[PDB]
Each structure stands twice: as C-alpha cells, then as structure tokens.
Amino acid sequence: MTMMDMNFKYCHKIMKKHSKSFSYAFDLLPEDQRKAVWAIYAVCRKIDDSIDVYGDIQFLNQIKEDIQSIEKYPYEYHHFQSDRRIMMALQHVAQHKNIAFQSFYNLIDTVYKDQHFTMFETDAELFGYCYGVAGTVGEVLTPILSDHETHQTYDVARRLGESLQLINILRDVGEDFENERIYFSKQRLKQYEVDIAEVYQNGVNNHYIDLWEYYAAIAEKDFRDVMDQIKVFSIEAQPIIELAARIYIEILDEVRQANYTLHERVFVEKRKKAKLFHEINSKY
Structure with missing residues (x-):
C-alpha cells in the first residue's frame, strides 16, 4: 500500500460508515472511478459534519481554503489545514479529472447558512x-x-x-x-x-x-x-x-x-x- 492508497482507503472508510447504500453501489465501479468517488464523497461528508467539531465555522473555513489551494495550484504541494488524507486524495483526483469547484463552494455555502x-x-x-x-x-x-x-x-x-x-x-x-x-x-x-x-x-x-x-x-x-x-x-x-x-x-x-x-x-x-x-x- 502506498501513502496515496492509504488516503483513499480512509476516504472509503468514511463513505461506507456514513452511507451503506451509496458504498454498496459505487464500490462496484472500476478501480480508478470508485477511488475518485470515495474522495469526492469523503470531502462532501467532512463539509457536512464540520460545524460540530468545535461548534464553529473554524474547521469549515479550513476545508474551504484547502479546496481553493487545490483549484488554484493543483500541482503544488500544500500543507492542508483540515483533513490531509482527504485533501491529498482530492488533489490527486483533481490532477486527472475536471472538478467543478464552484459546486463544492455551493455546498459549503449551504452548510454555512444552515447554521442560521x-x-x-x-x-x-x-x-x-x-x-x-x-x-x-x-x-x-x-x-x-x-x-x-x-x-x-x-x-x-x-x-x-x-x-x-x-x-x-x-x-x-x-x-x-x-x-x-x-x-x-x-x-x-x-x-x-x-x-x-x-x-x-x-x-x-x-x-x-x-x-x-x-x-x-x-x-x-x-x-x-x-x-x-x-x-x-x-x-x-x-x-x-x-x-x-x-x-x-x-x-x-x-x-x-x-x-x-x-x-x-x-x-x-x-x-x-x-x-x-x-x-x-x-x-x-
């Protein structure tokens, strides 16, 4: 197992723990497509659960900065502020596939709003x-x-x-x-x-x-x-x-x-x- 496989395996664990239905189906994709789905999913999950870490937008602002670093400099090494394992995996996917970053920003904005x-x-x-x-x-x-x-x-x-x-x-x-x-x-x-x-x-x-x-x-x-x-x-x-x-x-x-x-x-x-x-x- 390389370090990257370890990142993806972790993203997988988060996906399967939160949704057995989605894991059940998407784990059936070919290897490279399911790994990308695991990472995208784990990122969305982290965003959805961010407010309950301290009870602040602290962690959410960090995830957002992390994603922005990837969008801006996809091939630069970043010292991620939130969940490294997940961000290294999303950056890995982002280097191979086109990611709609504005859609992650929309999700983040929705979770912010959900606080009020x-x-x-x-x-x-x-x-x-x-x-x-x-x-x-x-x-x-x-x-x-x-x-x-x-x-x-x-x-x-x-x-x-x-x-x-x-x-x-x-x-x-x-x-x-x-x-x-x-x-x-x-x-x-x-x-x-x-x-x-x-x-x-x-x-x-x-x-x-x-x-x-x-x-x-x-x-x-x-x-x-x-x-x-x-x-x-x-x-x-x-x-x-x-x-x-x-x-x-x-x-x-x-x-x-x-x-x-x-x-x-x-x-x-x-x-x-x-x-x-x-x-x-x-x-x-």
Missing part, C-alpha cells in the same frame, strides 16, 4: 436546499461517471442528487424534528394542514400521509426521468447509478411498510440491495 436555519416558506426554497446539499454533489461526481460531460450530464446528475436528498428527507422526518429541523415547506404544511410536532407526538394521520406522499411522488417522478436519461453516463457507470438510485428509491417503500413512523430510521436490508443488483445486472 429557518423553515422553508415554499417548496422552491426546499428544492433550492436540495440543490445545495446534494445536487452539488451530483455535479462534482459528473466528470467521474461520464465520458464526455454535456449540460445534459450535469442536469441529470443534479436531478438525481436532488431526488435522493428528498428521499432522505422523507425517511428522516422524525429524527430531523428531534434536531429541530423540519424540511417540508410552511406553504405545503399549511395546505395539507400538518403540524410535525403534533404528528411526532400523536402518530401519523391522513393529512400527514397525504403530504408525505405528495413529496414522494415528486421524488419518484424525478427518479424515472433520470432513469430515462441514464445513457448520458458512461457505460460502466450506468448500471451502478441505476442500482444507487433503486436502492435509494426502495427507502420509500420501507417507510410506508413502517407506517410512516417518525420514531425510527427505516432501511433497505443488505439482502434487498443484492436482489436489486441482481435485477439490474440482468439487463446489463
């Missing part, structure tokens, strides 16, 4: 948030999962990312509430007459279910539109991205089967992930 969180007044603000924390991630992965990126490739990756975030929001309603976060928009909560604290306390009901299903239908429609444009991606990545998306979509059925419970995190068993892989690998 206030509920979304409208669905447009919620979707803006989905772009920021996850559409951005699809953007940064785009050059890795495609032969020749076009605006379409980014469009699709972005849409997929936003759909997956909406699916996460839908799986995590109860846990997010405990952390004082509600992502459904005030517009929509009022329309459907839903009060999340009331539901967390008294259980689901038809209003809540209807509102939850209104968002799930948005996620599902966006998923199919992405599936119909799966070809923008390289041949080896197509089936992997399909598995990633299916494994994540399945979370919706899991939530339903648990009666939209707001008191536990549902999941797609590892055995079901292998079943979906069987299905997908059958058409590829």
Whole structure:
C-alpha cells in the first residue's frame, strides 16, 4: 500500500460508515472511478459534519481554503489545514479529472447558512436546499461517471442528487424534528394542514400521509426521468447509478411498510440491495 492508497482507503472508510447504500453501489465501479468517488464523497461528508467539531465555522473555513489551494495550484504541494488524507486524495483526483469547484463552494455555502436555519416558506426554497446539499454533489461526481460531460450530464446528475436528498428527507422526518429541523415547506404544511410536532407526538394521520406522499411522488417522478436519461453516463457507470438510485428509491417503500413512523430510521436490508443488483445486472 502506498501513502496515496492509504488516503483513499480512509476516504472509503468514511463513505461506507456514513452511507451503506451509496458504498454498496459505487464500490462496484472500476478501480480508478470508485477511488475518485470515495474522495469526492469523503470531502462532501467532512463539509457536512464540520460545524460540530468545535461548534464553529473554524474547521469549515479550513476545508474551504484547502479546496481553493487545490483549484488554484493543483500541482503544488500544500500543507492542508483540515483533513490531509482527504485533501491529498482530492488533489490527486483533481490532477486527472475536471472538478467543478464552484459546486463544492455551493455546498459549503449551504452548510454555512444552515447554521442560521429557518423553515422553508415554499417548496422552491426546499428544492433550492436540495440543490445545495446534494445536487452539488451530483455535479462534482459528473466528470467521474461520464465520458464526455454535456449540460445534459450535469442536469441529470443534479436531478438525481436532488431526488435522493428528498428521499432522505422523507425517511428522516422524525429524527430531523428531534434536531429541530423540519424540511417540508410552511406553504405545503399549511395546505395539507400538518403540524410535525403534533404528528411526532400523536402518530401519523391522513393529512400527514397525504403530504408525505405528495413529496414522494415528486421524488419518484424525478427518479424515472433520470432513469430515462441514464445513457448520458458512461457505460460502466450506468448500471451502478441505476442500482444507487433503486436502492435509494426502495427507502420509500420501507417507510410506508413502517407506517410512516417518525420514531425510527427505516432501511433497505443488505439482502434487498443484492436482489436489486441482481435485477439490474440482468439487463446489463
């Protein structure tokens, strides 16, 4: 193992610890593409968890400076201020692939803002948030999962990312509430007459279910539109991205089967992930 393999192995460990679904699917990419995905992912993860290190933007400002050093001088040695293992790996990827740095900056700006969180007044603000924390991630992965990126490739990756975030929001309603976060928009909560604290306390009901299903239908429609444009991606990545998306979509059925419970995190068993892989690998 060289020092660089060690950096990537660490990025892998962070990815697999935070998301078994994404690890499951993306670890199936050819070696050079999955290593790049591990590093990009670990960077995004570090950004998402930065504020809780001291309870300051300290660590986040450092990650940002680190990324900026890479963008400005990709072939210079840098003494990284945040997580060296991860930044050495991202710099390594950046020397071989085109990275959309502005997308990492958008993600960083979204996390900064999240320190002064206030509920979304409208669905447009919620979707803006989905772009920021996850559409951005699809953007940064785009050059890795495609032969020749076009605006379409980014469009699709972005849409997929936003759909997956909406699916996460839908799986995590109860846990997010405990952390004082509600992502459904005030517009929509009022329309459907839903009060999340009331539901967390008294259980689901038809209003809540209807509102939850209104968002799930948005996620599902966006998923199919992405599936119909799966070809923008390289041949080896197509089936992997399909598995990633299916494994994540399945979370919706899991939530339903648990009666939209707001008191536990549902999941797609590892055995079901292998079943979906069987299905997908059958058409590829």
